[PDB]
Every structure is written in C-alpha cells, then in structure tokens.
Amino acid sequence: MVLYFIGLGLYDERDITVKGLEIAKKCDYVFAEFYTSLMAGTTLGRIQKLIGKEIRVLSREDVELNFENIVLPLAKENDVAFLTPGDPLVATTHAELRIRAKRAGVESYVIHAPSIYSAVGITGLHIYKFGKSATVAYPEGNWFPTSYYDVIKENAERGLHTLLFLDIKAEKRMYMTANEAMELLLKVEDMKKGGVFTDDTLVVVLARAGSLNPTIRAGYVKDLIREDFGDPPHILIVPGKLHIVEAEYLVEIAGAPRMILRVNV
C-alpha cells in the first residue's frame, strides 16, 4: 500500500532504470500520463509489454483534478505506480501530488529516470553554466507569452546558458519545434528590441535526446531557423559566453560554424 512515481526516461521504453522496471513489474496497478513530454521512440504497447502490466493512461484533468479520486484510493490497498516521461518531477507539477498522497495517508516513493534537464550535457555545454530555465509557450488568442525572452536576457548578461523547454499540446498531438520557438523569439525581439535574440544569435538544438542518434546542431539563427531537425521533441538552448572547449565540441560534434571558435573573451 504504497505509491511509486516512476520516470520512463527520454526516448523509449528502455530509458527506464532497472530500479524502476523491477518495481513497476511488481505493482498491483499502474497508471501513467503522457502529456508532460513526448517519448518519440516507443508506444504504450511496448511499455506495457516490458512492465507486463495494463497501464491506464490519465489526462491532465484526471491528474490535476482527480488524482486523489482515481489513483490514491487504490494505493491505500495496493502497491500503485504512476509513470511519466523523463523524470517525474522535472518541469512538471507532479511534486505536489506527493503532498496529496501524504494527506491521503499514502506513502510515496520516487524513481528517477534520465531527464532532458541533464541530457543537455550531450551538447558539450557545461551544465553548471546553465542559469534560469524557461518555457516557450504557444500564443493563444490575444495572449502572447514573452517572459522566456527576459530569462534569456538575464542569463546572457551573466554569461550563463539558457535552457528553453518547448511547448506541448499532447491532446492535439502538437509538439513545438525549435524552428517555431525561434520564430516566436524573433517576434518578441521586434517588440521589445532588446538585442537579445536576432539572426546573429548563436543557438543549440537538441532533438530526441535519449535515442542513439539524436540531432545535435549549433549555429546562428539565420541559418538554423529553417533547417529540419527531425521529429519532436525538441529543446532550444541560447548559450552564454562560451568556454573554448564548449565551442570546440559544438564545432566538432554539432557542426557549428568554425568562426565560433574564436571567442571574444
């Protein structure tokens, strides 16, 4: 009579940790959500096969409004698991579900899985150099989100890199590409005109991290804004001032233009 929050990792069913798999195999009931991120290399069927259980998938409303009425009841009698893409507590509000579990008298445990937040290390950029992170959200109606632009500005003034989670509307099967996030940023730039994101800004794209062949590309917005980075999910990074070894990696591994090697210390 326990609840496990188990991450499924970055790309496919095998990105689950061994810990997570052996525990999920022995749970009486398994629930999951696939709206906080997209695992482009697997299916519900392959996940069910691996864990050997029937997974019931919940929507954002099931989780946000009825988690305590749908999942918690069973965890009082049984050992229940709640699976999520990547790490369950990164760039989600699932941490709060722990609090609901405690007041329902249910003990909860967390099994981590690889997360996009640390997988950025594959870009060659020093992970300690990342500053505040932000989310590029799709505009809707007359509401046009722009706070993520200011995040970039603040980080870059400090010489820190900016990680940008891209929006996702899983019920619409919509996954924001790096391209779309660049276009949105250029628009915010025309408006605020702070010189923060232009045709000359160096960016880094990481798509489908976790796969054996993720797309890793670095370059100026003018040259990458229309490039095909493959299927989602995508993440966009606006680097701060680069260390030489960072630049060397972006060039050798991410095909960045030779000219970024000459940093302006």
Ligand X SMILES: Nc1ncnc2c1ncn2[C@@H]1O[C@H](CSCC[C@H](N)C(=O)O)[C@@H](O)[C@H]1O
Residue 161 assigned ligand-binding role: no
Would you count residue 115 as binding ligand X (CB under 6 A)?
A: yes
Residue 166 assigned ligand-binding role: yes
Question: 3-class DSSP state for residue 199?
Answer: coil
- Say which entry of a second copy, ligand X, none residue 235 contacts (CB below 5 to 8 A, set by partner kind): ligand X
Q: How far is the CB of 203 from a second copy (least distance, A)?
A: 18
Q: Which of 114, 158, 96 is nearest to 132 (CA)?
A: 158
| DSSP 8-state code for residue 52 | T
CA 31 to CA 3: how far, in whole Å? Answer: 10
Q: Which of 225, 221, 217 is nearest to 250 (CA)?
A: 217
Of residues 6 and 184, the one with the C-beta less far from a second copy: 6
Would you count residue 32 as binding ligand X (CB under 6 A)?
A: no
| DSSP 8-state code for residue 140 | B
Q: How far is the CB of 226 from a second copy (least distance, A)?
A: 27
Residue 243 assigned ligand-binding role: no
Would you count residue 239 as binding ligand X (CB under 6 A)?
A: no
The helix-helix angle for 60-70 and 95-103 (nearest 10°) equals 20
CA distances from 249 to 65, 166, 255 (A): 45, 24, 9
Q: Which residues bind a second copy (CB under 8 A)?
A: 7, 9-10, 12-19, 21-22, 50, 86-93, 95-96, 98-99, 102-103, 109-110, 112-115, 117-119, 121-122, 124, 126-135, 154, 158, 160, 165, 209-210, 212-213, 245, 248-249, 252-253
Q: How far is the CB of 159 from ligand X (least distance, A)?
A: 21
Q: How far is the CB of 265 from a second copy (least distance, A)?
A: 15
Quote the tokens at residue 95: 């941490």
Q: How far is the CB of 40 from ligand X (least distance, A)?
A: 7
Residue 116 assigned ligand-binding role: yes
Quote the tokens at residue 241: 């001032």
Residue 189 has a CB neighbour count (10 Å cut-off) of 20
Would you count residue 92 as binding ligand X (CB under 6 A)?
A: yes
Residue 160 has a CB neighbour count (10 Å cut-off) of 18
- Say which entry of a second copy, ligand X, none residue 37 contacts (CB below 5 to 8 A, set by partner kind): ligand X
Would you count residue 235 as binding ligand X (CB under 6 A)?
A: yes
Q: What b/e string do you get for 124-139 counting C-beta neighbours within 10 Å, with b at 16 or more?
A: bbeeebbbebbbbbbe
- Say which entry of a second copy, ligand X, none residue 36 contacts (CB below 5 to 8 A, set by partner kind): ligand X
Beta strands across the sheet bearing 202-207: 134-136, 162-166, 234-238, 202-207, 215-220
- In the annotated binding site, the residues are 10, 87, 90, 115-116, 166, 209, 234
* Site residues (vs ligand X, CB under 6 A): 10-11, 36-37, 85-87, 90-92, 115-118, 165-166, 168, 206-210, 233-235
Binding-site residues for S-adenosyl-L-methionine sit at 10, 87, 90, 115-116, 166, 209, 234
